[PDB]
Ligand binder design. Sequence first.
Ligand SMILES: O=C(O)[C@H](O)c1ccccc1
Ligand SMILES: [Co+2]
Length: 327
Amino acid sequence: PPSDIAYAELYVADDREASGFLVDSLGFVPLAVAGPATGTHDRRSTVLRSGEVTLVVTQALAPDTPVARYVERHGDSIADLAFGCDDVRSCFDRAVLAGAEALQAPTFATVSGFGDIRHTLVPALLPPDRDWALLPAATGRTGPRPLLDHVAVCLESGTLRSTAEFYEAAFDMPYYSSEYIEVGEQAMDMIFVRNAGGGITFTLIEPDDTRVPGQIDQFLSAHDGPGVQHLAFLVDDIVGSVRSLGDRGVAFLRTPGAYYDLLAIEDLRETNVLADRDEWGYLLQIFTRSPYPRGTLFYEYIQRNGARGFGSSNIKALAEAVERERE
Ligand SMILES: O=C(O)[C@H](O)c1ccccc1
Ligand SMILES: [Co+2]
């Protein structure tokens, strides 16, 4: 089965705006591009990289193409979470066996997943379905950080268990941990799934329909269905990163000073970074505001100092920061 996430592909209405924020604010570097001059007539795509995180930003160049249809439905959104496989044929078979729809058969392959996401399957390197014109930066060595810590996915009520069962069977990503999180009168249920290697961690999040609609329901109506709510990037110095990023225009969600009174500490306070711990050490986390029109996808920065999993105290204070922002 898949060892790692190869890349995430963002479908967008305006790649100037979307890639501009990822490059000029977050610091991603363009590596390669595809478009009419490389034989890809219906869209322009750009591969961006930072450390080991690869994002592909893709914009339709004609109305009523699949990309254009996707973006009209969902807004700017992740449409593809690509898996790197030691043996693609084997990954594809195991996935179809588990009930994954065959969206394109091994010509590299594409299977379905939660909501209308795609999972392109690729050798564990740029996407294999299009031909790429390289930038000079593509020919140079990349840092080991940042790396993609986990992907958070919003699911419709009553689909959490069967989504998790699918990911266990299709991709060998079994249960890792679960949390039930309450904010005000709303709540959400989540399961973290993770493969044996630890290369792939998803947060599967469903809203609790026995409580009052909240931020997960809002995500689902804005995005118009299940989708990726956030990508989290693992960094060595989240305080430093949040300082430089803040300088390049990045808006992070704020936490009240109250939280810091309870809880180095002056550094976290200043940066609105959240701290929690597991049996093996601490983790620091922060969310950015969504930079997209519908207020859906956003980014997370995480630093692990020994922590292997996730802390229920950070999850709650993150979800509180999103609600303060939502209002
Ligand atoms: O970062 C995490 O622990 C996790 O993906 C998460 C999901 C939903 C709200 C807050 C946090
Ligand atoms: Co997260």
